[PDB]
Design a protein around this ligand. Structure first.
Ligand SMILES: [Zn+2]
Length: 257
């Protein structure tokens, strides 16, 4: 019953998911003057060479590109992390116009979209178990800044016609998730939550400082998706972002500064 409209949107999620008003909620605004250095932090290690994409799916809230996380195929290590995290899926958040859509903001600046690469700590054996633990998940966030068309990204947007409505899926093999990363991997990090229900406070957020590009024409395609299933009255997926939440006792750290 949750979504992003007037009566089911982020303001109302707390009715079914009281943790929405928790102490470690995401996204947040990254106040760059407040960012702290920490000598414990390392370079990110994105070990995506053997990444194996499987399918793309419209789940009525966004669309996900799913990865085979049966083995250590595409992993995230180092950065702020202890141990090894496996990539399970990535997905996007976007807005109804180009001036908004990112979930994290940077000194209150909003980008057109935000990509989330979701990973789980292999110490827990499976995603479901990892998801209930403070150190269980790690999500890399990447901003999409309107400008030049992005080839790579197009490679994803072309498949959207095959999954217009809720529950539809399409084969999507051999997509390199590294192709959607900036080449410089400087990051901000803070302890946070999933940005969609159930909003579990089990995420180590790693938000890249450098955006990737997307054109205005490309942004249109995200907005062609349907929230509804086929045979139901149309309700376009015009926007699917949660706004910034109170930072409360937390500090954002930056690497390398
Ligand atoms: Zn997300």
């Amino acid at each position: 019953h949750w979504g992003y409209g007037k009566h089911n949107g982020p303001e109302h999620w707390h009715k079914d998911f009281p943790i929405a008003n928790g102490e470690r909620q995401s996204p947040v605004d990254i106040d760059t003057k407040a960012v702290v250095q920490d000598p414990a932090l390392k370079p990110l290690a994105l070990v995506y060479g053997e990444a194996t994409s499987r399918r793309m799916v419209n789940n009525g809230h966004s669309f996900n590109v799913e990865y085979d996380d049966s083995q250590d195929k595409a992993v995230l290590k180092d950065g702020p992390l202890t141990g090894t995290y496996r990539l399970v899926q990535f997905h996007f958040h976007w807005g109804s116009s180009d001036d908004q859509g990112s979930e994290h903001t940077v000194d209150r600046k909003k980008y057109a979209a935000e990509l989330h690469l979701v990973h789980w700590n292999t110490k827990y054996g499976d995603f479901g178990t990892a998801a209930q633990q403070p150190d269980g998940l790690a999500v890399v966030g990447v901003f999409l800044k309107v400008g030049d068309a992005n080839p790579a990204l197009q490679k994803v947007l072309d498949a959207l016609d095959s999954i217009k409505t809720k529950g539809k899926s399409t084969d999507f093999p051999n997509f390199d998730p590294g192709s959607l990363l900036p080449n410089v991997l400087d990051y901000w990090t803070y302890p946070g939550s999933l940005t969609t229900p159930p909003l579990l406070e089990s995420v180590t957020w790693i938000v890249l400082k450098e955006p990737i590009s997307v054109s205005s024409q490309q942004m249109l395609k995200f907005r062609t998706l349907n929230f509804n299933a086929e045979g139901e009255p149309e309700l376009l997926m015009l926007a699917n972002w949660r706004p910034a939440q109170p930072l409360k006792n937390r500090q954002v750290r930056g690497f390398p500064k």
